Amino acid sequence: CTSLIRLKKQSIKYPSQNVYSHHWQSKDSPLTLIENQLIEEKSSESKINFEKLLNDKLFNDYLIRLLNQSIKSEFIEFDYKTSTVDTLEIDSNNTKLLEKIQSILKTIDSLDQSIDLASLKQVIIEKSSSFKKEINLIEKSIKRIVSLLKGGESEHFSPSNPSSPNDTPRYNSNNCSSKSNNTSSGADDDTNNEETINQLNNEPFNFSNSQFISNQNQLISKTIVNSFDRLINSIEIGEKKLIKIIDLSSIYQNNQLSKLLLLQLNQLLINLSNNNNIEIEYTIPSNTKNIDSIKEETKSISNLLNIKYRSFDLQDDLESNGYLNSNYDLIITSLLLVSTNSIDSNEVLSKLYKLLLPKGQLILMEPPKDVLSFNLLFANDFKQSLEIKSEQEIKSLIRYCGFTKIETNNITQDDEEEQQQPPSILIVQTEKRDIESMSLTFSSDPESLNSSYSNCIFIVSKEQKENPTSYIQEYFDITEVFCDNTTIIEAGDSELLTKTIESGIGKNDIIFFLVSLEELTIENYKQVTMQYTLVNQILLRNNLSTRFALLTYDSQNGGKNYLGSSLIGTFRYFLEFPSLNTFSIDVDKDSIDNLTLFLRLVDLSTIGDRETIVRNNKIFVQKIFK
């Protein structure tokens, strides 16, 4: 009699793929910023020489030459400059191009028409590292400017035909494709030299070869890894910590920043492979054009740092792509304000802010607008390059989206006998609004915590401090119960409880359970657990949107009340349902008075999961580690 399964006879295969542990780390980020008073570190020599490159009329003559050749490259025989015609688009001519060219030539005339780009060009090329791969960028700027303004446009902002009468404009640009490709060898035979107009167009702004961008990345990497060094040196005994780091410069700048980031992170952890009370979920998203470079540049770094090679595009919904509100701790972003056309910078900052954990660092390395030629190296069109703003505007926009402690880190180098310069790139590392104080809205205003709730019912026990006023005040005052109907219903009084919760309770109605704060006997805990289960059953059976927050004591790390875990377990069972919005908080005796904080804990937006521990006013979540 033969079976069909290989039989492993009582073997001992030491489980390595199935062990998951449980800890409790403080959800509010323990990450701490660096003091801006020490940001002096020299690695770049090309930025000082670039600021020296200004006020050099020979570069201006190079500008004149490029503008002349761009004027010539438009059309071989087309009129300009007095006359025919002086009109403008639209109705009807390409004279918008004519006026743009005349303004460009008006700027051209002053002031030099002499020899250019031999001596100073050789000197600067040998001085910084090479400026041929900078003149190429500045030339390709105007070359692709004329390529874009040529594009498919020289006309055709024409009025859409209003017929039929009262035809509202309807736009929809998805689910469209061309039919059909390569019919009768169309545009295939007799083809050659048809793509010479745009040949530097497919070669992007190169930053890897030159070492100045690498110096920028080195400064950023060292400043981040020093804070991480501080954190790991302040590691706690027997408490693993999960860190969610996402870098969005991996789609905008070269990966080199993240390259050195991973290199030094893994190097540091390898030098310090003696404690495993910390793990790092480092993640690198890309737009399906740098995933290849990212995954091929990194080979074996995932030893202790869980790496997730994914895709994040800032034009899609955060929740749709899987990213959640108050989900990830640290975000590092460079070349961001130069990377948008239609998205408001406040909207980009809101995108960054929503994902952030409480006080989670937002590192934003953005260019200032003190030198325009310095901004011409970050975008290739008249639109994105000027989407950048000044330092004060960046600060105000960061404070606009609810950020505290803006840290201005002006990258400062110091080359001897070489002039000073404005900051090479402004680095602002701010933190999310402190989890101690928010409101349910996006920006802090206590309208949602005060006089926003209509009915707040309190489950109490009349076996200690029979009066409910002092029973609640025994742990936190009753005055902070801010609702139009301060109601208290006896524990076990489920009939009037059913009547009250079935007559109607609004979305801003909450029910705190203060019976799980006393030391439960060896029999009564089943009784109160049954009461709770019936309460949640009646809540769900009518599909209500009531907010519930259970408050328990010492029932999630062991102590005087180890019996509330039954309540917590059945509550956990209910959480799989979407109709029942319920939370649970375990607090000690010495931090039990934070009623306003508990009201804040109803936040699905700025706070994360629906189970937390408050110790010494610090909010914790349980983390499970492979």
UniProtKB/Swiss-Prot annotation:
UniProt biased composition (Low complexity): 158-185
Annotated segments matching region Disordered: 152-201
Induction cue: Up-regulated by P.aeruginosa, PAO1 strain and PA14 strain infection and down-regulated by phagocytic stimuli and growth on bacteria.
Superkingdom of this protein's organism: Eukaryota
Further comment found in the protein's record: Encoded by one of the numerous copies of polyketide synthase genes and clustered as a pair pks16/pks17 in chromosome 2.
Written domain comment of the UniProt record: Modular protein that is responsible for the completion of one condensation-processing cycle. The beta-ketoacyl synthase region is responsible for the actual condensation reaction while the acyl/malonyl transferase region is responsible for incorporating carboxylic acids units onto an acyl carrier protein (ACP) domain.
The protein's role, per its UniProt record: Probable polyketide synthase.
Protein name from the UniProt record: Probable polyketide synthase 16
Organism: Dictyostelium discoideum
Residues of the full protein shown: 1207 to 1832 of 2603
